[PDB]
């Protein structure tokens, strides 16, 4: 797996590959690892597919459960701490092989400056978190390759499109070096999923946009 | 890894992928797994890269050694036996992780019928061997996918050229389902290597031919 | 074991073999592994016979329990989640050898287009699941042979007849390469079972239809 | 695997299946497990394919080696002893998975009575051996089914052809109950192999003959 | 450790950091890991400091010993094989913690195509080797970061100067993300080792030149 | 990690590096390991990032919980006992890798002398504690280097400013000899955090001041 | 143990403590850890006493053996290599508790600058070595205290006498923080040993001078 997230002016983008493996064997081509967890939050999870999807579903339900009970959504800090509590709670099963490493992207409607209201929170397996200040982050087996790619491309991000393209290209590099991260499948038309989030909320990115970017990156590296 | 070999009327063909891994990490893109071991035999080996290459080089040396000492090459049976002995002798290292699983494709200059002089010999890790009589064989992490593909595609083998297209297609199905087997890389121009052996000897198939078959396969799958 | 499921225009088909083993010894010849679990759902389980049959039985009971208590059946998404929760809850026992891997086929009377209302859901030993979008899937010790067979035969599926044929022939290839999958027994008159589901519901394919399909396949492969 | 051997009046027969497995996976359909190791002797071996075949080859080479050196072939007792020693030598390796379990069938040209010149000798993994006096024997994962089938079928053996048929039928029952033992494959045309030995020596039974016997058995059970 | 090597028109460059650790403790600041092993060859080794140094020394002696014994240096192929045999020979010790993972750069005075006589050979711990064809490679705990850095920077290599700049910048990225790799030390005036090889031989890059490259990279990233 | 604390006339200072690692790999550059845990108290924590931060958070909530329930803040001794009990409660987890090892710097508003009222308390992983009488202390993988530095530089501490200088230079030496301790990052502009506590309470030290001191030490060494 | 070595203008000095322990128990008070191995070379070894002493003895015999065989002494490099090889040879024993970690000081009579002819080489348990370029080094359980002490004191080293003072004071700090390093015993009159090496060769430092410097350090810290 590789999930990436990066801040662009007035928003965040998160994107994730579509591969599922069992050892060397490809068990999935179309898995979704990035979920809109609320109107201003998307979560992307690496590790054991079953636990990862379960984390995403549970998290979204907890957030909305608080919203309906108390009349108001959690503060972003609260959302961070609830995800962190979930990860810590899973530490023992993680060490037994039921792993879930999340990566949180969101838009803080209570931030002062909308330009930097985007938030990228990374986590370790003990529940430790860090709000990232350098613009991008990644999780999963290809996360190193993706992070080193964004280290070189991130300065190209000036809007939603350039950010979405840098994310997709970072996933392209990850799949190029990590066999457990799926690259774009142009025979099948399967492409990484991506969620973008700004003041108008969190939306899924149309498959055709990501398809187009993938093709441009491929051609760019061919000739 | 996936190595495939198959008989066609008058000859035999063996093709191998190009990928190297260390866990999920892709460590090589252009490794070679099929070697012309003598004028009428090619050997393709799956397993630890160092041990595979060493096997091919030593086997080829031993065959030519016998040839120059005795004024004649070994019978095809003898060549089988020397490979089987090499494998058996490596069994204990294989048990500790230094594995070499070979696959033998050759042409028997002493067979009565030159159209059925092609030989495909598979091996197990204990040095057992079987002269494959159903037309095709594969070894490596992707070999069950490649076998099951060739099972359906083998009626298309009517000469060396459709044999080569079927070998390349089997390797394509293998890369489709096994992340330790590398598919054709159209960005970089790296394709499986292939050897074709007939009455005139064993010769390497040029890259551009395999590339052409690969693009035909991809453009067929892609509708 | 091999259980296969595949979609055809307007519905879905699931079929399973009849063999039971304890090691190399054949302990059963007519066991049933594919059950109609409700009017529009069939479940096919691989693993330990006792746990597989128990899963089918308890799952069907659970679904009907819901429908009687609330006056309406679970959504298809509900059904998926309930099965997944069963598998997950059985994990530890599975790690101790009491394994039960289901494969779920169904027709969703609440889908938009009843011609793509077919559903194929595969699972892993954790609760993890995936809705198959490529038209076929298989579970059990023959699932790789069967899926690779279907990868080559699926283009022939244009209706339930060709769907049932491709399913029975995938089970034939499976039995052909996997000794723990039983092929058609022409001496005893024992054949894989099948369920077909379309907008009229789920129905057991009568044994004689499977028999003549099996005979056709065999004669195909003899000449 | 299943290897069977039985005595008929004036000779012996041995037949073996053709299946090779790795766990549940069928890895071979045409392996040969019964070999003519000399003009009056056949060995059939169960276990690890490479070791089975290596044993047959080295055993035949060894016997013929004695024959060329000393100008005369080993007594039947000496052949038994050489096989038994070869099996005992493999014990450590066999405990690690490189198992070879032989079954010997021969005709003793120095026996007293040609009617009782047939020999069937069974072995265990320690090299212990026994000369079968009850008419038949078998070795491999299917051997119990083959032997319980022969126990009921042996009274039909009255000549070479009925003994061959009983052997093929025993192997058929073995395959019916043991998945590591391959039955007749009518689609591909692969059948058990068989050697028959009498006063004129050991020969390979032709594949057609076994095919007919198998088709007869199948039809009879349908 | 991080060692990088890359090709440029007419030559090759290799460079390595200066750091030695014992767990988290810094135990050396001026260590040297890149050695001119003969007039046209340099070796950079990661792993246990004592093994790596010993490997370099012994390998140099081996090459020159052949050269004096036979009146002629080994082919480049033979130098590869000899290093590989040395590594294989060290496998068991490597598994007990006495690792030496070499990287080979050279200039082949007998190159078929005198245009591309530069050579870069990588090695795994079993003695497997591969002649890099994509222009660069790295070895050591920082090697993934250097390889992704160079993946982004390699197009800027058009001569020995730019090639040396990209090498040192890859080292800088490596130390940026790997505490086991030492960055430049402007306080003590300690910088990475480098060697550059072309048709006129192999030469140690003066420290001052690496100092200027380090200062250019640092100012580039300060603003 | 290195956390340092040292007493100066009328106060105390605590300062911590910004590095997080997983093995050799740098996983964070800007983490905060030093926390104002109440108006007169800071805690620096070495160990597992998640457990460390959790300790600081829980501890601050606990001290204020007492204060709001009882109308008055815990004595300094009680504050120590509550941290120590927390550490002891975590010993089982700490043996399995989830380690939090704290260092307490406070100002005791109840002490006799408002110039020697600064308090530095060190802890061990069982919750044992000691009130440091020799003026300075440190914790974390770099704590030995930091302490051997302050041993030499502590005579230069005459006020809050010089004490902060010695604290940042101790952190510098720690970074020089321990790769799990981050040194000043002039390119990115990340510097150790520091808190100073005196009679006026605990206050965060402005980054720009720590940056100044770091540049002065860096220049001094070259 | 703590063994220190540092360069002064035109020479080098090496000093070591006198303590031998078994667990917590003091088992020796006057052990010598620093040995003149030849006219221009001194070696000090931490680790297992028996092995350390055996290493120093056999090493001196090795160097003198080469000198009498070849009519000339080894180059400084050669002496290094011989020690490194000896250390690598003991690696397995060391891994099982029979450890020998040496520190090497010398004056290279074949050096270019007579003032840059001092030489300090450190080693790891695998036979890795490094020629130290920053002026000082130390080995033993107290070598981090000793090296951090010398990091701060090395500026005061301007001649051989000041260098000796820094060596002894570094050892003193080592003893202050490491119970396996023995500080000056004024009651018994046992003090560290010290070799000085310059162009005129290597010499034992008289005990009276080290005792003098020791009491100066002690009185200085009260
Ligand atoms: C005890 C156990 C482990 C497994 C296992 O390996 N399960 C695989 C997943 C898998 O084979 N599947 C096919 C069948 C239907 C469900 C699913 C899609 C996995 O989890 N593999 C890991 C290595 C993986 O690929 N994880 C990627 C991933 C991450 C987040 C996410 F949401 C989905 C994902 F696939 N199963 O049981
Ligand atoms: C202890 C240890 C393990 C390994 C290891 O996994 N070594 C890899 C090989 C590797 O990482 N390499 C890049 C650097 C240079 C040489 C080579 C190309 C391997 O053997 N991996 C296996 C899984 C593999 O991919 N095998 C495929 C293969 C088959 C035949 C062949 F000739 C070459 C191949 F790469 N090495 O040391
Ligand atoms: C703890 C334990 C397990 C077993 C065991 O392996 N029990 C076998 C089943 C068996 O010997 N039996 C005959 C008598 C009774 C009924 C049944 C039919 C099995 O579970 N074998 C597994 C490997 C198997 O063959 N599974 C195929 C299968 C799948 C789904 C299903 F519904 C039924 C099936 F037989 N025995 O004890
Ligand atoms: C350590 C090890 C074991 C094995 C293994 O299981 N090897 C299988 C054999 C196999 O997969 N093969 C195909 C490829 C080449 C040769 C052979 C034909 C086996 O030995 N299986 C055993 C259980 C078996 O099936 N034995 C039947 C048998 C008996 C005698 C004989 F001569 C030949 C046979 F196949 N391989 O390495
Ligand atoms: C690794 C292994 C185990 C065995 C094993 O248990 N071998 C059995 C003997 C056996 O199955 N056989 C038939 C096939 C040919 C030879 C022999 C006749 C045994 O040794 N069983 C023991 C428990 C036994 O019965 N011992 C009785 C005995 C004592 C003395 C003697 F001379 C002969 C005997 F059979 N053999 O190899
Ligand atoms: C059995 C054993 C291993 C070690 C150990 O970890 N020894 C360290 C090296 C060390 O502490 N040293 C200082 C004193 C002498 C010289 C040397 C420089 C190491 O090998 N560390 C590894 C992790 C390392 O940093 N390796 C980097 C490296 C690579 C190539 C090279 F040539 C030199 C290097 F230091 N010690 O004992
Ligand atoms: C069981 C387990 C351990 C770990 C682990 O090693 N976790 C690392 C921390 C890490 O990789 N992270 C990035 C993303 C999330 C948040 C955090 C910042 C750690 O704890 N490393 C230790 C060695 C460490 O660096 N501790 C330093 C430290 C001390 C106090 C503090 F408050 C914060 C700190 F980072 N993960 O799971
Ligand atoms: C089972 C066993 C224990 C030991 C052991 O610990 N042996 C001690 C030495 C000791 O107890 N002794 C008194 C009796 C006479 C010999 C000596 C003086 C040691 O080696 N302890 C280590 C920890 C130590 O203190 N080493 C200091 C040292 C270093 C170098 C040197 F040359 C001399 C030294 F004493 N050896 O074997």
UniProtKB/Swiss-Prot annotation, chains D, F, G:
<comment type="pathway">
    <text>Protein degradation; proteasomal Pup-dependent pathway.</text>
</comment>
<dbReference type="GO" id="GO:0005886">
    <property type="term" value="C:plasma membrane"/>
</dbReference>
<keyword id="KW-0865">Zymogen</keyword>
<feature type="active site" description="Nucleophile">
    <location>
        <position position="1"/>
    </location>
</feature>
<comment type="subunit">
    <text>The 20S proteasome core is composed of 14 alpha and 14 beta subunits that assemble into four stacked heptameric rings, resulting in a barrel-shaped structure. The two inner rings, each composed of seven catalytic beta subunits, are sandwiched by two outer rings, each composed of seven alpha subunits. The catalytic chamber with the active sites is on the inside of the barrel. Has a gated structure, the ends of the cylinder being occluded by the N-termini of the alpha-subunits. Is capped by the proteasome-associated ATPase, ARC (Mpa).</text>
</comment>
<dbReference type="GO" id="GO:0035375">
    <property type="term" value="F:zymogen binding"/>
</dbReference>
<dbReference type="GO" id="GO:0030682">
    <property type="term" value="P:symbiont-mediated perturbation of host defenses"/>
</dbReference>
<comment type="similarity">
    <text>Belongs to the peptidase T1B family.</text>
</comment>
<dbReference type="GO" id="GO:0043161">
    <property type="term" value="P:proteasome-mediated ubiquitin-dependent protein catabolic process"/>
</dbReference>
<keyword id="KW-0647">Proteasome</keyword>
<dbReference type="GO" id="GO:0004298">
    <property type="term" value="F:threonine-type endopeptidase activity"/>
</dbReference>
<dbReference type="GO" id="GO:0019774">
    <property type="term" value="C:proteasome core complex, beta-subunit complex"/>
</dbReference>
<dbReference type="GO" id="GO:0010498">
    <property type="term" value="P:proteasomal protein catabolic process"/>
</dbReference>
<keyword id="KW-0645">Protease</keyword>
<feature type="site" description="Covalent link with the inhibitor MLN-273">
    <location>
        <position position="1"/>
    </location>
</feature>
<keyword id="KW-0378">Hydrolase</keyword>
<comment type="function">
    <text>Component of the proteasome core, a large protease complex with broad specificity involved in protein degradation. The M.tuberculosis proteasome is able to cleave oligopeptides not only after hydrophobic but also after basic, acidic and small neutral residues. In complex with the ATPase Mpa, degrades protein targets conjugated to a prokaryotic ubiquitin-like protein (Pup). Among the identified substrates of the M.tuberculosis proteasome are the pupylated FabD, PanB and Mpa proteins.</text>
</comment>
<dbReference type="GO" id="GO:0019941">
    <property type="term" value="P:modification-dependent protein catabolic process"/>
</dbReference>
<dbReference type="GO" id="GO:0051603">
    <property type="term" value="P:proteolysis involved in protein catabolic process"/>
</dbReference>
<keyword id="KW-0597">Phosphoprotein</keyword>
<keyword id="KW-0963">Cytoplasm</keyword>
<protein>
    <recommendedName>
        <fullName>Proteasome subunit beta</fullName>
        <ecNumber>3.4.25.1</ecNumber>
    </recommendedName>
</protein>
<dbReference type="GO" id="GO:0005737">
    <property type="term" value="C:cytoplasm"/>
</dbReference>
<keyword id="KW-0843">Virulence</keyword>
<keyword id="KW-0068">Autocatalytic cleavage</keyword>
<dbReference type="GO" id="GO:0005576">
    <property type="term" value="C:extracellular region"/>
</dbReference>
<keyword id="KW-0888">Threonine protease</keyword>
